[PDB]
């Protein structure tokens, strides 16, 4: 943390944050969501970390270089340690990325090493090559070298993500799937796990062995698992929470903005809210059905009438303001909603659905007052504009993510937030073999467009290919884009260091501090 000369700090440097839901896991190789990564940044530290404005900065790696953007050399700081006092070496990075790549780990982010184009990942992922073949190597204890199959200019931006953080082999090999329990876990970030009571709290305390420990201010942070955005806010107002999770209740927001204007933080956010369609299951394997649902949803009602928190109506998957995106607005988004409804109705008639034998299906969401309210509104809009009958289902966060990966659904509420600020952070998730493809979408034409982005000379050409890849995805109606998110959350006035300027929201509790109040 960089406390402003002049500010006085409080005596007790404790922080309470809501975290949206109970994490899937604390193992960096088993996580995929925002709740999981909020915890993961305070516990595990990879090669690079984000600074308070979101820029890639020194993490375990104090300095690095690249050869033709294809060979990256990371110089690890000589004092990096694990919470047990042991040294963090380039060998821990070797072992960890091999464990991420191994199909036996089953990581939802195994494909992050494919996004980075590390040599040999595809065969390793396919089980054709053993994980020991991965293009990484410890040149010496403090020198980690990565070799990629194509130049990847933004390679370093990928590295602040939890799946490329190191995991402690001794703990992992001795305790198996119990390595993350408090009595067993070994960590390397600014904090260490003090307590974890399922569905109640996660308590982290300062990790004295952190290399940047003199700059850590907050001695303890608790993360709550509250999925009701109403209860999160209520507990914030009662004084129990200093930082709400960043999902705001529709019910109370207008009230909050007028009653405590300066605690309502509302900042840019590279996330997209959409309805995920299970592309591999009839009748969702018919593009006419997918397109009719995409066109019949009325985003203006959703964004401006039901929610009205500053979200922008969406027509793509990658947010148009991502760095390096220059997207082509599609024709259907230029029409009036009435015309969208008429085309939508024709498309479903063509697919054979009647007013008397309508298309019916489940609309699944992760338990939440926000998502429930939006899904009730969406079901009514679709009923009214297209004649579809939807049945709402809700699942708890962890269960919900497992359903999506397994394909045990029809249509699901969804949100993807960038892992790095560059369009392939969104576009790589729709690749046929990506481990993050819960759309179950497979388009050889889309895969090629993305693969050609690593084979071209200039950024102009890359940017045009990302626009064509968004167009192919829209033409296939793989999803129903709804809105681009704003990052909206309540932060008490004594919480310092939360600037709201990082469009990925990669908050580190070591960078925050309690102002005396
Ligand atoms: U437009
Ligand atoms: U269903």
Joined together, the tokens standing for residue 31 give 């996580």
Distance 364 CA to ligand 2 centre (A): 10
Backbone interruptions in the chain following residues (C to N > 2.5 Å): none
Domain end residue (candidates: 168, 193, 208): 168
- The answer on 216 and 123 residing in a single domain is no
Tell me how far the alpha carbon of residue 352 lies from the centroid of ligand 2, in angstroms: 18
Q: What does R_g of the chain's alpha carbons equal in angstroms?
A: 23
Cβ of 49: how many Cβ atoms within 10 Å?
Answer: 24
What does the DSSP 8-state code read for residue 343?
H
Q: In sequence order, what are the residues at sequence separation of 6 or more whose Cβ sits closer than 8 angstroms to the Cβ of residue 437?
A: 429, 430, 431
Give 73: exposed, middle or buried? Use CB within 10 Å, 0-12, 13-18, 19+.
Answer: middle
CA of 390 to the centre of ligand 2 (A): 9
Last residue of a domain, one of 148, 168, 188: 168
Long-range contacts of 304-311 (CB under 8 A, 24+ apart): 306/250, 306/373, 306/374, 306/377, 307/250, 307/374, 307/483, 308/254, 309/248, 309/250, 309/253, 309/266, 309/486, 309/488, 310/266, 310/486, 310/488, 311/273, 311/483, 311/484, 311/485, 311/486
Q: What are phi and psi of 49, to 5 degrees?
A: -130, 165
104 and 197 within one domain: no
Residues 110, 30 within the same domain: no
Which ligand is located closest to the Cα atom of residue 312? Answer: 1
d(C-alpha 442, C-alpha 423), whole Å: 19
If you measure from the C-alpha of residue 472 to the centroid of ligand 1, how many angstroms do you get, rounded to a whole number? 19
Are residues 297 and 381 in contact, defined by beta-carbon separation less than 8 angstroms? yes
Q: Closest Cα to residue 83, out of 207, 263, 236?
A: 207
* SS3 call for 351: coil
**Residue 365 Cα to ligand 2 middle (Å):** 14
- Cβ atoms of residues 347 and 288 within 8 Å: yes
What's the number of CA atoms in the CB half-sphere (13 Å) around residue 139?
Answer: 12
Residues 346 and 450 in one domain: yes
Using alpha carbons, list the distances in angstroms from residue 208 to 26, 83, 189, 511: 20, 7, 10, 15
Start-to-end CA distance of the chain, whole Å, equals: 19
Task: Name the strand (E) or helix (H) holding 468.
Answer: helix 459-475
Nearest to 27 by CA among 17, 37, 16, 18: 37
Task: Give residues with Cβ within 8 angstroms of 50, minimum separation 6.
Answer: 56, 57, 160, 502, 504, 506, 508
**What tokens were used for 316?**
């793509």
Span from the CA of 34 to the centroid of ligand 2 (angstroms) = 27
Nearest ligand to the C-alpha atom of residue 361: 2
Q: How far is the CA of 283 from the centre of ligand 1 (A)?
A: 31
* Ligand located closest to 331 CA: 1
Beta bridge partners of 360: 389
Q: Supply angle C-alpha 153, 156, 162, rounded to 5.
A: 140
Contact 113, 126 (CB under 8 A): no
- Biggest CA–CA distance in the chain, Å, is 71
CA of 298 to the centre of ligand 1 (A): 15
CB neighbours (10 Å) of residue 396? 14
- For residue 206, list its beta bridge partners: 191
What CATH number does residue 142 fall under? Answer: 3.90.76.10
DSSP summary character for residue 241: -
Query: Is there a cis peptide before residue 347, judged by omega within 30 degrees of 0?
Result: no
Q: CA dist 322 to 152, 326, 368, 448, 474, Å?
A: 17, 9, 27, 21, 18
Does residue 159 share a domain with residue 77? Answer: yes
Residue 356 and residue 209 in one domain: no
CA of 19 to the centre of ligand 1 (A): 36
* Helix residue ranges per DSSP H, 104-228: 112-115, 121-126, 155-158, 169-175
Measured in Å, residue 447 CA sits from the centre of ligand 1 at: 28
Distance between CA atoms of 15 and 17, rounded to whole angstroms? 7
The H-assigned helical ranges of 306-336 are none
CA dist 251 and 370 (Å) reads: 9
Based on the domain organization, do 420 and 365 belong to the same domain? yes
289 and 321, same domain (yes or no): yes
Q: Which CATH number does the domain housing residue 452 bear?
A: 3.10.105.10
Q: Which two tokens stand for residue 172?
A: 């992992």
3-class SS of residue 145: strand
Beta pairing partners, 479:
276
| Sheet of 264-277, strands arranged across | 312-313, 479-490, 264-277, 411-417, 360-366, 389-395
DSSP assignment of 40-83, as one string? HHHH---SEEE-TTS-EEESSEEEEEEETTTEEEEEE-TT-B-T
- Token digits of residue 120: 């040999």
Separation in Å, CA 209 to CA 213, 373, 391: 7, 45, 52
Euclidean distance between CA atoms 43 and 48, whole angstroms: 14
What are the strands of the beta sheet with 143-147, ordered from one edge?
61-67, 71-76, 143-147, 136-140
Write the DSSP symbol of residue 305: I
- Residue 3 C-alpha to ligand 1 middle, in angstroms? 44
The three-class DSSP label of residue 242 is coil
Q: Which two tokens stand for residue 330?
A: 């599609």
DSSP 3-state of 403: helix
Ligand positioned closest to the Cα atom of 329: 1
Residue 442 corresponds to which tokens in the numbers above? 């497979």
Q: Solved how?
A: X-ray
Q: 3-class secondary structure for 368-381?
A: CHHHHHHHHHHHHH
Place of tokens 């990564």: 37
266 and 287 inside one domain: no
- CATH code of 266's domain: 3.40.190.10
Q: How many Å apart are CA 246 and CA 271, to the nearest integer?
A: 12
Structure tokens at 385: 């504009």
Q: Considering every ligand atom, which ligand is closest to the CA of 327? A: 1
Ligand with smallest separation from the Cα of 410? 2
Q: Where are the alpha helices (DSSP H) in 112-243?
A: 112-115, 121-126, 155-158, 169-175, 229-237
Output the CA 327–ligand 1 centroid distance in Å.
Answer: 12
Q: Residues with Cβ < 8 Å from 367, sequence gap 6 or more?
A: 21, 227, 394, 395, 396, 397, 400
| CA separation for the pair 414, 118 (Å, rounded) | 29
Pick the ligand that lies closest to the CA of residue 359.
2
As to burial, measured by CB atoms within 10 angstroms (0-12 exposed, 13-18 middle, 19+ buried), residue 36 is buried
- Going by their DSSP bridges, the two strands 389-395 and 61-67 should be labelled as unpaired
Q: Tell me, in angstroms, the distance from the centre of ligand 2 to residue 52's CA.
A: 44
- Sign (positive/negative) of CA torsion 300, 303, 304, 306? positive
Distance 391 CA to ligand 2 centre (A): 8
Q: How many CA atoms lie within 13 A of 17 on its CB side?
A: 26
In angstroms, the CA 511 to CA 298 distance is: 40
Closest by CA position to 385, among listed 339, 334, 351: 339
Number of domains in the chain: 3
Cα 360 to ligand 2 centre (Å):
8
Q: What residues form DSSP beta bridges with 196?
A: 202
Looking at the structure, do residues 387 and 409 belong to the same domain, yes or no? yes
Q: What ligand is nearest to the CA atom of residue 332? A: 1
19, 249, 395 from 226: Cα distances, Å = 7, 12, 14
- Do 83 and 124 lie in one domain? The reply is yes
* Tokens describing residue 44: 């595990």
Q: Domain range spanning residue 394? A: 271-486
Q: Collapsing DSSP states into helix, strand and coil, what is residue 264?
A: strand
Nearest to 275 by CA among 478, 435, 21: 478
Residue that the structure tokens 């070496």 belong to: 89
For the CA of 313, the nearest ligand = 1
Angle formed at CA 43 by CA 38 and CA 49, multiple of 5 degrees: 70
Q: Are residues 356 and 448 in the same domain?
A: yes
Q: Minimum-distance ligand to the CA of 391?
A: 2
Please tell me the distance from the alpha carbon of residue 186 to that of residue 488, in angstroms, as a whole number. 33
């Amino acid at each position: 943390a960089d406390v402003p000369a002049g500010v006085q700090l409080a005596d007790k440097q404790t922080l309470v944050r809501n975290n949206g839901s109970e994490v899937q896991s604390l193992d960096p190789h088993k996580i995929e969501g925002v709740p999981e990564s909020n915890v993961s940044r305070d516990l595990f530290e990879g090669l690079l970390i984000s600074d308070v404005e979101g820029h890639p900065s020194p993490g375990v790696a104090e300095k690095w270089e690249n050869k033709d953007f294809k060979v990256w050399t990371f110089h690890l700081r000589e004092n990096a340690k694990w919470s047990d006092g042991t040294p963090v070496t380039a060998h821990d990075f070797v072992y960890s990325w091999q464990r991420l790549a191994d199909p036996n780990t089953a990581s939802p982010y195994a494909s992050y090493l494919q996004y980075g184009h590390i040599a040999n990942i595809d065969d390793i992922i396919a089980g054709k090559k053993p994980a020991t073949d991965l293009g990484v190597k410890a040149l010496d204890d403090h020198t980690f070298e990565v070799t990629l199959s194509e130049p990847v200019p933004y390679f370093y931006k990928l590295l602040v993500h939890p799946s490329v953080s190191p995991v402690p082999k001794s703990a992992v090999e001795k305790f198996g799937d119990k390595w993350t329990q408090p009595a067993n876990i070994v960590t390397n970030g600014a904090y260490k796990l003090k307590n974890w009571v399922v569905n109640e709290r996660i308590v982290l305390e300062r990790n004295p062995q952190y290399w940047d420990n003199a700059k850590t201010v907050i001695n303890q942070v608790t993360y709550l698992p509250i999925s009701s955005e109403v209860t999160d806010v209520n507990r914030y107002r009662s004084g129990e929470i200093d930082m709400t999770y960043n999902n705001m209740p529709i019910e109370l927001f207008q009230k909050l903005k007028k009653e405590i204007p300066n605690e309502v933080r509302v900042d840019p956010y590279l996330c997209t809210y959409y309805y995920e369609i299970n592309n591999q299951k009839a009748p969702f394997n018919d593009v006419r059905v997918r397109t009719a649902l995409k066109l019949a949803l009325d985003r203006d009602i959703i964004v401006n009438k039901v929610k009205n928190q500053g979200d922008l109506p969406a027509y793509s998957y990658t947010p148009p303001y991502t760095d390096g995106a220059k997207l082509v607005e599609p024709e259907w988004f230029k029409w009036s909603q009435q015309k969208r409804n008429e085309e939508a109705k024709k498309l479903l008639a063509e697919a054979g659905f009647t007013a008397d034998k309508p298309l019916t299906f489940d609309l699944l969401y992760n338990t939440s007052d926000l998502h429930k309210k939006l899904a009730i509104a969406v079901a009514s809009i679709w009923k009214k504009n297209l004649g579809v009958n939807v049945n709402l289902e809700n699942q708890e966060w962890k269960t919900f993510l497992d359903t999506r990966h397994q394909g045990t659904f029809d249509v699901a509420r969804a949100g993807w937030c960038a892992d790095y600020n560059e369009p392939t952070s969104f576009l790589n998730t729709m690749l046929s073999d990506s481990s993050n493809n819960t759309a179950h979408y497979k388009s050889p034409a889309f895969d090629k467009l993305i693969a050609d982005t690593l084979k071209v000379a200039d950024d102009t050409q890359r940017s045009e290919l990302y626009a064509k890849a968004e167009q192919q995805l829209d033409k296939d109606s793989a999803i129903v884009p709804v809105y681009y998110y704003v990052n909206a959350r309540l932060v008490k006035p004594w919480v310092g260091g939360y600037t709201g300027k990082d469009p990925l929201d990669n908050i580190y509790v070591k960078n925050l501090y309690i102002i005396k109040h």
